[PDB]
Symmetry: C3
Amino acid sequence: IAAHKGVNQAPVPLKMERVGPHDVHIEMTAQITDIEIDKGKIYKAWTFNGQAPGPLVVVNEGDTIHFTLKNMDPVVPHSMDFHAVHASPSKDFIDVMPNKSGTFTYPANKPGVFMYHCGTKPVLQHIANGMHGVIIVKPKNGYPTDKEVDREYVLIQNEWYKYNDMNDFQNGVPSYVVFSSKALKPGDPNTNGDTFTLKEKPLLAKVGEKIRLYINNVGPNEVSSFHVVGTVFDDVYLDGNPNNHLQGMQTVMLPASGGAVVEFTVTRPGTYPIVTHQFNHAQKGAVAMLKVTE
Amino acid sequence: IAAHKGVNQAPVPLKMERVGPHDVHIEMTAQITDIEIDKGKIYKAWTFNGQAPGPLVVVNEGDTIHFTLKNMDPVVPHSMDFHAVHASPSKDFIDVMPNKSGTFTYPANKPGVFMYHCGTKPVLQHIANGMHGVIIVKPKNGYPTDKEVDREYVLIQNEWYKYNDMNDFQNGVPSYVVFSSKALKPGDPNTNGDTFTLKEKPLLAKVGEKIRLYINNVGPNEVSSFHVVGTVFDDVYLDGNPNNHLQGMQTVMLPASGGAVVEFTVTRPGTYPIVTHQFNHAQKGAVAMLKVTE
Amino acid sequence: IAAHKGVNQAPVPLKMERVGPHDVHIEMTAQITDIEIDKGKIYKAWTFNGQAPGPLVVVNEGDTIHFTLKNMDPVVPHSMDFHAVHASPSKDFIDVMPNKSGTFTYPANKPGVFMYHCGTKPVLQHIANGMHGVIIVKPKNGYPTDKEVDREYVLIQNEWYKYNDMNDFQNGVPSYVVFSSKALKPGDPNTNGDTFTLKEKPLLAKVGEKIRLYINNVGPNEVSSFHVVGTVFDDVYLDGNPNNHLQGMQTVMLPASGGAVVEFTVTRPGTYPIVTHQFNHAQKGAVAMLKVTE
Ligand SMILES: [Cu+2]
Ligand SMILES: [Cu+2]
Ligand SMILES: [Cu+2]
Ligand SMILES: [Cu+2]
Ligand SMILES: [Cu+2]
Ligand SMILES: [Cu+2]
Ligand SMILES: [Cu+2]
Ligand SMILES: [Cu+2]
Ligand SMILES: [Cu+2]
Ligand SMILES: [Cu+2]
Ligand SMILES: [Cu+2]
Ligand SMILES: [Cu+2]
Ligand SMILES: [Cu+2]
Ligand SMILES: [Cu+2]
Ligand SMILES: [Cu+2]
Ligand SMILES: [Cu+2]
Ligand SMILES: [Cu+2]
Ligand SMILES: [Cu+2]
């Protein structure tokens, strides 16, 4: 795209504020940002807020979201689809033209770990070029294992293909498959989907802790066989709904767009890889590390 | 196949009749029929009854099926495998030669949404060329959410490859991935697996309704990440068994041959896409629409 | 690998012995062994004990495993990762150099049907060349359907690619996809992952029996749509955990590394194919047979 040549828009922080007991304002941008997806490889991503996956959004079950999208792309229209919400797609997930803004409103009345993404046609193009992320909706009455959890992180899986290559997006294998982590609390890491960051700067935990991961596989195209080496998931909630409650799973199957809450215990000091167990994807990037110390 | 050149056998209606409180007769054909799978693209499909996927079959839990297959193919043998039934494959799913008929009998004692398909070797060839469909077995005591449902439809996912190309069927990506809908009640649409019909003639619903979809992914080869844009599934029954009961799922993972009953609420007027969220498949056809009016 | 040319190390039996009420010794080898994976096709596999998948391991829930690996490979390091155990990967799943041994100790405190595999980098290479298998951990209080089961077998799914070809392992479709069976009791078959053995020498059962299969899909890369032709699974326990309890499933979705216990009834005499319903995989080998007699 000739209007993207040389464009590298600095990342902009997510803006969010609660405006009532059950109402929240969220304010994101669509923007064109260079991301290093593998060592030496820059992808001029289409993003929300200059991150891909986009910034983490967390709301409470029952919250109405009043969402604004500011489109900084000079030429391409963008939009937002949150999987958390009940909405009319053809009224509420519509395009925002270059250099304009749009505001849309809709309720999040289901707890869980939901994908969000651009919904502009062709959707595959928009998601593959980087316009994906996660919204977590916290359950009103929690999960039944809340009191057992010591520490929590967010992980997102995505793929990268040949740059803006529709034929590759539809017909090709991924070039890279990657994890990212998005921050829940001050001090947590906040990364982009790349092959290396969570290997070189592992997530951190303490011996004996029960870890919860909020996870989503945003695709665009692949399913994920999510596994943590050296442990067994004690509890799994499919899509993060507390009712969907599995126990003792070695590996969690995630459809494209699928989420889960998983919880496991790290019993001994050491570094614990986190993988998709489709090992062609692992090999192409999708390995994160959790370093567990005394 | 030289004996298929120029062959285009008109579709024949499914014949079905109840012959006892727990016994039903079903009568299908195997036939060679030209189907438009994408605009301008004809596939000379191998079919049941001149539809691909084949016609919908609905029986009650406990019904014995007395199934007859009339093979109208001039040269290729065909057969029937219903996933609903308990049967001896090597006695009851056997071939019916060109211009002959065979009758087989077997019980459907498990509720759910089951694939059926030809079982002639090589099975991949027979399923890929179009010999697939769905049988629904209705549970004796229903589903626990029956009283909440306003409206229901059947959707089937399948793939199409290069015409009768075994190498492509085994080694290639799909050319097209498509939905079809099969009628449950008078007036419902009844379509074939193509890229466009359920975009141009959407399924219809009313604002506020709870929708149930009977869904099956017949493959042959891919798994499906089934999602309805702008809603969350309130309830999911895996394989349509009322015991397998998930809640609040954004996306349902379907193995090849896998089914589900899913239920969701459409809260606002508009058009709601229905997709597999493996967006390379979506892009290659697998998008249906649900138009929701006042 | 020049040091593997001409190498074909005879298979060595698994050594296992109980050394306390909750402690077991296991002793395996890593070795280079020619396996016939399809008729006329030899793969010089990297294996545990000269079988691929490796030998079956069965322990009780609560057992500590004291595992020894003897590396007979003349040049490549190997390791062991059991999905059953809680362990520090970077202390307990470490490499054993050529012509050396290592002993590692760790608890299996979760019931189920777990993958094991080499964990040497690049893991994809080690798993693809044959270093995979299953450990079953038997639940302390069984499964609730134990008393209904007549007969049981173990089945494992894996893929084979172009020989030791990293590009193919990461980017290519499988050449073959295969089942194997591993013995639980004297007289049961014990086979390697190949296209033909369980077609030519089917598993055996009697009319009317309820069959349990312990199943795992070891990948490396594909997911599995597991189905038995001519029946419906009465009960399914995901990952073999008795809590994860589905009913009436036609087809069970298995992630890569994913397991299950499945149970079904064979009602009539005949031969019952067992497949992955991703029929491109079936066609490339992944069909086993169960011959059911009076
Ligand atoms: Cu309130
Ligand atoms: Cu507002
Ligand atoms: Cu966009
Ligand atoms: Cu979506
Ligand atoms: Cu792929
Ligand atoms: Cu703790
Ligand atoms: Cu009766
Ligand atoms: Cu009859
Ligand atoms: Cu046929
Ligand atoms: Cu089948
Ligand atoms: Cu494909
Ligand atoms: Cu209603
Ligand atoms: Cu004891
Ligand atoms: Cu010992
Ligand atoms: Cu190894
Ligand atoms: Cu593993
Ligand atoms: Cu493949
Ligand atoms: Cu019995």
